[PDB]
Design an enzyme around this catalytic site. Structure first.
Site, PDB file in Angstrom:
ATOM      1  N   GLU A  11      60.750 -10.598  43.715  1.00 51.61           N
ATOM      2  CA  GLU A  11      59.712 -11.529  43.344  1.00 51.61           C
ATOM      3  C   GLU A  11      60.212 -12.860  42.817  1.00 51.61           C
ATOM      4  O   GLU A  11      59.496 -13.847  42.911  1.00 51.61           O
ATOM      5  CB  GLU A  11      58.720 -10.920  42.335  1.00 51.61           C
ATOM      6  CG  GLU A  11      58.080  -9.652  42.830  1.00 51.61           C
ATOM      7  CD  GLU A  11      56.958  -9.895  43.800  1.00 51.61           C
ATOM      8  OE1 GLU A  11      56.747 -11.161  44.052  1.00 51.61           O
ATOM      9  OE2 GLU A  11      56.333  -8.998  44.311  1.00 51.61           O
ATOM     10  N   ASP A  20      52.089 -17.901  46.198  1.00 50.62           N
ATOM     11  CA  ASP A  20      52.831 -16.810  46.747  1.00 50.62           C
ATOM     12  C   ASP A  20      52.902 -16.869  48.278  1.00 50.62           C
ATOM     13  O   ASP A  20      52.385 -17.792  48.875  1.00 50.62           O
ATOM     14  CB  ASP A  20      52.332 -15.499  46.202  1.00 50.62           C
ATOM     15  CG  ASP A  20      51.077 -14.947  46.806  1.00 50.62           C
ATOM     16  OD1 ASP A  20      50.476 -15.693  47.692  1.00 50.62           O
ATOM     17  OD2 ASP A  20      50.675 -13.869  46.503  1.00 50.62           O
TER      18      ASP A  20
END
Ligand SMILES: [Cl-]
Ligand SMILES: [Cl-]
Ligand SMILES: [Cl-]
EC number: 3.2.1.17
Length: 162
Positions: A11, A20
């Site tokens: 991440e 994202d």
């Protein structure tokens, strides 16, 4: 290696609101804020999550705190999900981490939908499950990360993260 270090690798860590891979406002270590296209809706969710006026920026401690909550919540959601729990309980420690990683990225509902793969995992048909997992939007959209998780389920080792 452990679930924390694994997710940190997949991440990343960003202290300012960013988008994202799906275009959603996120912060920290993959902490989704909202699916709303509004930056204002995201800043507001951020302030609510942190308990202060952040102006879209957080510290490393705050990111870590959100992350600890999110891992806990991911894991606990698996235990509460009738379709996921039995799979998780059947797995060894390493593979358990792989399943938590997928739930963290895609949500419990999303994972619970991989019916065929879950069945192969529970049966411990590793190579077959690896093949089945790959026939998915997940794999096509985030191939590098998916391969890492897939190799993890396949081998039961952390090799893909080394
Ligand atoms: Cl929160
Ligand atoms: Cl139990
Ligand atoms: Cl990727």
């Amino acid at each position: 290696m452990n679930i924390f270090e694994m997710l940190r690798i997949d991440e990343g860590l960003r202290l300012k609101i960013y988008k994202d891979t799906e275009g959603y406002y996120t912060i920290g270590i993959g902490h989704l804020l909202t699916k709303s296209p509004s930056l204002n809706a995201a800043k507001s969710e951020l302030d609510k999550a942190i308990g202060r006026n952040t102006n879209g920026v957080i510290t490393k401690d705050e990111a870590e705190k959100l992350f600890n909550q999110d891992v806990d919540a991911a894991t606990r959601g698996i235990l509460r999900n009738a379709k996921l729990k039995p799979v998780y309980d059947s797995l060894d420690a390493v593979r358990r981490a792989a399943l938590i990683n997928m739930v963290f990225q895609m949500g419990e509902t999303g994972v619970a939908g991989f019916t065929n793969s879950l069945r192969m995992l529970q049966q411990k048909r590793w190579d077959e499950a690896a093949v089945n997992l790959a026939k998915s939007r997940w794999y096509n959209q985030t191939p590098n990360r998916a391969k890492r998780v897939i190799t993890t389920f396949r081998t039961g080792t952390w090799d893909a993260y080394k």
